[model samples]
Target: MKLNIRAQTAQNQHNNSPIVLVHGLFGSLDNLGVLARDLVNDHNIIQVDVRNHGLSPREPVMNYPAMAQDLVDTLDALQIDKATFIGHSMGGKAVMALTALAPDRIDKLVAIDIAPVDYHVRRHDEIFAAINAVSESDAQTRQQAAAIMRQHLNEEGVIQFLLKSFVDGEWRFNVPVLWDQYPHIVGWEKIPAWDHPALFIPGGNSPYVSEQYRDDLLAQFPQARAHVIAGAGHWVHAEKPDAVLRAIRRYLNDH
Candidate 1:
């Protein structure tokens, strides 16, 4: 039930609902810091590292239901009666699961660059291989570790992102557990309708979100609206921070 949370209050406080930021796989609370940096001026923020990642406790089993309950338990412990959730990738799905379990508690939902359905592909194989190689290697320094990762991973940005958890020649994330739970993380089972307002922001250039599953997307979130960020990939928020920030600000204000 205990999730590692980094709480931040607004500089110019409004009566807005507290904003909860949820990070994606292999990420921590700091992963959403870019969005937090701007939004903190308007609303209080609760950034969390979902279980099995970051500073949160590790477990053998990790699935959407377990993750969903973890978020609910964390909010309950904080005595938050209602809140808006901003989630990216897997975090978004976790929020979706929460909607099914505790709809009344959700003030608003913003799902960034992800859909509610199970994904067919398993694209993290290369990334996992790289991580295991680094963990098993005798690399002494962070630079040496990065050098070892560069051998397996081609994307500089991805390599660097993964290296953040690679501290003291070890991983902050539980690699074996995550690898074992990969199927559950990628797979999905639909929940009942949550016909409240919801926002979905997807990278225009990414295949993760598309009109192909528009009906499926709408089935669970009938009132869901999408904002596609052009010229961005999977990491839309990072690629176009200003655009993403502006979108979020407008959404919060309108809804």
Candidate 2:
């Protein structure tokens, strides 16, 4: 499925290669603006909205293959033959899936706050409920929608991050469709070993990636390594943009 994707260029262009920025669930390409700004001096940013999120077309199937193909389609449309990917949460899994499908198209990968194995916990139940509540509420303003979502979620950051998608009393993305495919978004299956270099940036406070998943990460991406961002949660880039940027720049510069 073809999705909405944009290639952003800045005043300073250090190279001709593209760096794809994939956002997490319930997020838009804009979610990575901070990182994009930091890297705009060099790489062309291929900011994308995955299916069922942001400005992308929605689909009932949210499995990895569909999501991966959607990325490939976006790249093909833009004539981006090969690119580096920086993905967060569900976006990370999508990148992994794309690597499994077409390794040659990928230069390298940065998996943020996610793992290669299935997540045992059902962490999105409340999030789904919160989004559903906002969807069903008669709230007219974003504040009203936020107020309605507060009943299900308390994190200000989460509410704010989610509110970005809530516009004109409805979500910009497909909420109902996402709720239907929530399982596949969180589900994970092992992929063939990819020799390409990969980096896993885990939030120190986030359980999304840890020593528990080290073997699994290395199993598929033997050249992969982890760099934990202290004092951050699932939203690592948001909370610690400088650290994330440094980690990305340092690795991409050397490798």
Candidate 3:
């Protein structure tokens, strides 16, 4: 379960713990380029493209366990015993799974805009339909694909994000497989209690974190603290990069 990883480090400096950035569904390692660039000056960064997305190989099952294993393989390949992890959406679940599977390998953890419970609602179907419509219609250009997606997704920002997965003259992501595994994608993976310092950044507009899931979140991550980014939805990092960075800095500085 080897993962495709891209590593970068700042010059004339040594950082003890490297930071890994994992993107959400239909996203790639480069999705968090802005944030990664912001922290590269102070930390060694490893941005990963999870399996079934970006340049990574696709599998029939896109569950958390397998995805977490992929992260482990990537770390082991890099000879990194332990590192800090920052994950969004699907990536967040993967971090939780990894911490449970190999707690010692995680120095710190950050789960952004997602909770450790299954989301009853399913919104990815519309996205998958949009992608399929464009692919079937031979809309090879970004502008063409964006036009098609505009009909299905109202937000211009979301359409642009999904367009990143459209690459090499084709959609690099496994759309059909993702559509089939949407349930698992939105489901939670139960893990034993992890006492490590963890931060949960929830978007004010997103329902991923609520009173119902608070107990579950704290039960697994006892040291976890929740921070809400006002006026943001699932894409909190993109919507509020400065605020997100400030909060992350505080977490690192405090610990």
Candidate 4:
């Protein structure tokens, strides 16, 4: 399946590569709007709602291979032979898996706050609890869902982000399938190295991309470079967009 996509033409069109923006867990196509809004000025932007999230189709299985295939299929559907990919969290892994699937279709790659190793951690138990609580409470309004989510989640930003998918009284994301595939979601099947100038922008305070995974990351992306945004967390682009964009623009030009 091609998943759901929103294509934005550049305000100042150039021969530059088109940019594909992908979001993380509990996110939708709009999650990376911070990057999209700015990049759309110069590069064509293709934002997608990864399967099981946003308005995309819901399925029982959620894995990198299938997710990568979806990306390729979506590109083929749009006749986008190649483009730069900017993906965050789970979406980042999908982008990396893409290098193994259809590397020739990639112009450049940027992975925000994610590594290639199996995290081996259930980082969203409380998030699942919050989402399930909202569903079970029959909350029809975002305000009502926020209240229920607040009881389980401490991050106001997280609660607000999750609320975007809460339409009418139901979540747009397929929560049951995501919960069932938690293991596969956090697991990794190392792909052969993609010897290209891949840029990794990690939030200084985010554990998702850390020194601990340097070897694993290098093993997969031998030419990968890092640009750490100080004092930021997992959502580096949202927290320090100017810094993130500066780094990305520089990489987009340098390579």
Best by TM-score: 4
Q: Write the per-residue lDDT of candidate 3 for residues 205-243, one digit (tens) a residue.
A: 988887889898888888888889999989899999889
Q: Estimate each model's TM-score.
A: 0.97, 0.96, 0.96, 0.98
lDDT by residue (tens digit), candidate 2, 1-255:
777877777657666468899999899989988888877788888788988888788777788978888888888988889989999999999999898898888987899988888876678789888887877778878889888888988899999998998877778878777777777777887799998778899999998887887888889889887899998999999999999988998789865
Compose the digit string of candidate 4's lDDT tens values, residues 172-219. 899989999989888888999999999999999989888899999999
Winner of 1 and 3 under lDDT: 1
For candidate 1, lDDT tens digit of each residue in 1-255?
779999988989689999999988888888889999998998899999999888899899888888889988999989998999999999999998899988878898999999988887898998998888887889867799889888988888777777778777788898889988898898887988898878899999998789887888999999998999999988788789898888888888884
Residue-pair clashes per candidate: 0, 0, 0, 0
Report the backbone clash tally of model 3.
Answer: 0
How many backbone clashes can be found in candidate 4? 0
The alpha-carbon lDDT assigned to residue 236 of candidate 2 equals: 98
lDDT of 4: 0.93
Off by over 4 Å in 1: none
* Arranged by lDDT, best first: 4, 1, 3, 2
Runs with alpha carbons beyond 4 Å of true place in candidate 4:
none
Q: How close to the true structure is residue 17 of candidate 3, measured as C-alpha lDDT?
A: 82
